[PDB]
């Protein structure tokens, strides 16, 4: 079994797609192993670049294919090189930009946290072993973080493991285990932007909707609610169109639904106070009571939301 | 007739396009057959990867081209390999990402269910038979389902068949039947998100629209109706822009049309009650009757919608 | 002149682009001609697939290039094969997906009808003739039609013709006529969806806008119009954003403009009735007259729209 | 200096990108020059197509690369051919689809006019001269123009010139002038659609906004303005989202700004008339005066806009 | 160490992507060095174009690969050429369009300024030195600037430097320093468009919101605020949808949030003035005081924003 040492340099993780749970990773991949020694020009290591690489493979050079397991579509490989050492060492180095898949739960949207993973595995060989994996995710940790959209927490975690494929041929007596390198980078979303421009105004609207009870007439109370109703519909549209697209109910989507309910409940109470008492009494002890209670009931339900 | 065994590993089915009735399928395809025995290095099976494969084809190796019948544009094939066995067996294995087509009826949008199908067929040979198809759609069934957008019902069903092409040449006396593998995966859309964030507020708005009859004056009743009218127009826009795009009337689209009608009918009744009675009587037995009847008429019509 | 028989199988016509007047066509293309006889393996027809085809062309095999005249960008060709017959026949078969152009007038948008055309022509040869064209547009005609977006009317029409290119070289004495195959498929748009979810609510709003005349006060009449004004602005936005994009005025766009005018004319009449009569008379014989007349004037102008 | 005669057939100019000032050009390019005579099959001109062309170049055939100077990314070339004449003539013909750049001023958006240009230049040779350029922009001039989005004014203008590159090597004593072909096609946008569906309603809204002065009460006058304000905000959104995107203020954008100002100026006058006169007088000679003057002040300022 | 002279011609910098902090660069790259002398046809420098270049590399020609460090995906290279001089000089020249990455802070959006940078580095050699970098950013400086979206300030800055890579192999005793060319072009965004069509109406709306205090009744004051509330929600949507997309709070977003706060504070003051005084007094000295003070308080807070 050939010992393969890999190194993955991650330049940038960007372009997260919430609809398809994917993310882009730009960087380099280096893999080193030792083969039979070789006569090189003079005796310095020989450099073979791009189109010249397949010329060496056609003459018999063994270059194993390593596949990104969780990639989404063939990645864009930039420059690639082979470094052929006279003592037998071989170093493959290539620039790449690829889109990778991982299970991503966005339910607690503004305050959610995700981990971006890479999964590397040889495409055809089980008799060849990944010896050690070093990733160099040397993007900043203390340069721009409050300004940046995602907060990387710690240095990336690595784990070389062995994957057992059962459904295989019938001629392999026991060779159905492959070496898989797994890189993981944990990150937390910076909610600053979504707090100020989305959650804050949504609170301001939800709060100010309760000021309908400070209207004197019943006609004033009920008719204004329909203008508040339209405002929440507008704000829900503004929220869903500008924020990333999701077929899942987010924290903000609960806040939106809560606002929807708060207005509908107000309409019920406003009509209730009118027609609850005999002979047209307006239950003024209700309008004034919920004038402060209605704000409190929402805050109590919000805490049980975090139950 | 050559016996070819295929195996299709489905990693992920995603990216449904409602406008073009397409869907993306990432996974692997394996095909195995037995040919004339062959001298391999030593005597272990030889592995030929990617660019090296066409070198073997130029020297005479027979590798049939299998076409995805229902594919939408040439798919993106990642790494590919040939496993050449000394006794004659040949195993082709390739990673692919492709877009596939099938008839998809989205009319009952939030609660609809679809089946994703693959159709495999040799491109040039009828004297070569697909012997058995095993698909490994080992995506979860009981890990994430309530969180996931689609619910896979069962393991994929397959069907190898023979397709008769009539319009052909004139030199084939009887050989116009091709082996077609057909894989089918049934799935049900998870309506959780669309119920809470779309159907529920639409109900709350439609319901609260009936509270126009609880206004005392006629001027209050008619003018408020026009503000409710704007809200339904606003909500239909929010609905059509955020939800997947469709040139077909969906369940939600019927609910939207229903809200449109409920408001217009209210305006008729509101105006009717004013000018229906002689000498300016306001038919107060109507406003109060439909105050509860108008909500009920909508519920009765909704049940005949499910007829 | 070489006799070339073509056959075009049309799997699917989809993805009409109203902004660029284009549409996608998936299917196969077959071309057959007879050349000098040939020694084949044994004596069965030889099959040459994909990358192996250019190998035969480099050894001298004459394979003419057929260009889609009205294609938009080089089309995506899937699998391709050559079938070489010993008696001299040669059959080229290839799967393709391409985007094609044709003049498409969408002015009567919901009820418009278009025809999708293909135009085939050899790229370099005029001394080579397309002998007969058979298209197999065996998409359904009586399976799904009311559910489908477009209605195909009849079997596709074909026409081989001769195109005269004048601006050419100076060395051709008379050879400037090329063989062109022209396929035409006529189709009518299914207006069901646009009627119910777009045309119907637009009528309901336009109609209900006239109910402003049933308000008793003049202040009620004028102020309500401005809320109705906003509703038409809102509905025009919803219409233009969801419906296909066009730099041309459609039937719906005329209906929208009509709604704009109906409201502006209402504001004129409402203000006119106030200040038309001496000493502050409110011309109540106008408000009630146009209470019914204003709806009729719209219907009369709508019929002259179809003039 | 080799004499190269080019001819550019322009099939369609479409896909104007206002954000990036680009446009797509589909058509053919032909280039002819005379070289050393050649032994051809028999003695008829030889046709070399697509993949076969580079075979002749590897054997020594001189085929110069002509670059589209103003192209945006490598263009999509369809079929290409070489016609090798026995007397030495060589004719290169190729189908192409490319995106081209030019400075485009969209400030007078609905009524603007642009010119689409192509710039052709050899990539490596200054000792080779473009002898004459004939373009065949035989798209219609009198077939569909009122229906079409753009109006082509005349046949395209050509200009072969010499471009002086100063910053070059140090070994060229005087050879730093290159032959550049420049094609120009002038076009005027058909404003019919934008007039009816955008400019017309914006006028109606701006006009109808002035009808606020016909309200009797002061409370009626001020409150309605905010509904008209919302209408202009709504209409500004509808305008910017559907119309092509631009980081420049257009004619329509000025009309929008004008509507914003008309309403804001109205609010000032409405509040001014209330509190301008001593003892609470409502300056009724103002409300009625600007009832007609405010429309005129807008019309007077609009004519100074065309100053 | 080989001396390599590069020259970078920048035709156009366009397509800034605010979400991914990228920008497109179209232009040419020229690189010159001197090698062992060479026998050329006759003795003039030989020109080798495109596909013919790799033929010389297969025969042994050394052409080093230079990589754009900050590129986002492999760039699109148009025509490329080699100029082989008899005395040993070699000139590589290629057209390219590429997407490049750099840290871009858009927080002060309308008035922000950015710098577009390129970073060039050899892919495999440290024993080869970039001798001098000359960029020709000969885009206009005094032709169109007020009309153009970006303002280039000065001639582009260059800096050849040495980058120390630590994490490397174990066989290099001291050779881990690479030559990096860094080009920088400073640019300031032209805020003209965003001022007139976005900042100005936002001011007009924010200002006119203060006119709620000039209403006489309390019911008029509170109900109108909710219509003003909806207008800001609409305008926030229009702002975020049309302006470039950003997960960061911009100057406009602060102006938007300020408008949100201004209205909510008014609702508090409007309700405060009602219920602050004993026995139902309406604190008319507040409504009139903040009638002018509320405008001033916003202006006072706005200057401390620029603190």
Numbering used by the authors:
A (entry chain E), B (entry chain D), C (entry chain C), D (entry chain B), E (entry chain A): 11 to 317
Report text from the authors:
Both mutants crystallized in the same nonconducting conformation that has been observed in all known ELIC structures. Neither of the two mutants display ligand-induced channel activity in any of numerous independent recordings. In the background of the mutant R91A, both nonactivatable mutants F116A and Y258A bind agonist and antagonist with similar Keff as the single mutant R91A, thus emphasizing that the mutation has likely not affected ligand binding but instead interfered with channel activation. In both nonconducting conformations, the interactions with the C-terminal part of the M2-M3 loop with the β6-β7 linker remain intact, and the observed nonactivating phenotype of respective mutations (F116A and Y258A in ELIC and F115A and Y250A in GLIC) could thus originate from an interruption of the coupling between the extracellular domain and the pore region.
During activation of a pentameric ligand-gated ion channel (pLGIC), the binding of agonists promotes the opening of a selective ion conduction pore at a distance of more than 50 Å away from the binding sites. Each subunit consists of a predominantly β-stranded extracellular domain and an α-helical transmembrane pore, which interact via an extended interface. Whereas ELIC forms a cation-selective channel with high conductance that is activated with high efficacy by the primary amines cysteamine, propylamine, and GABA, the cation-selective GLIC is activated by protons and inhibited by bulky positively charged compounds that also act as open channel blockers of the nAChR.
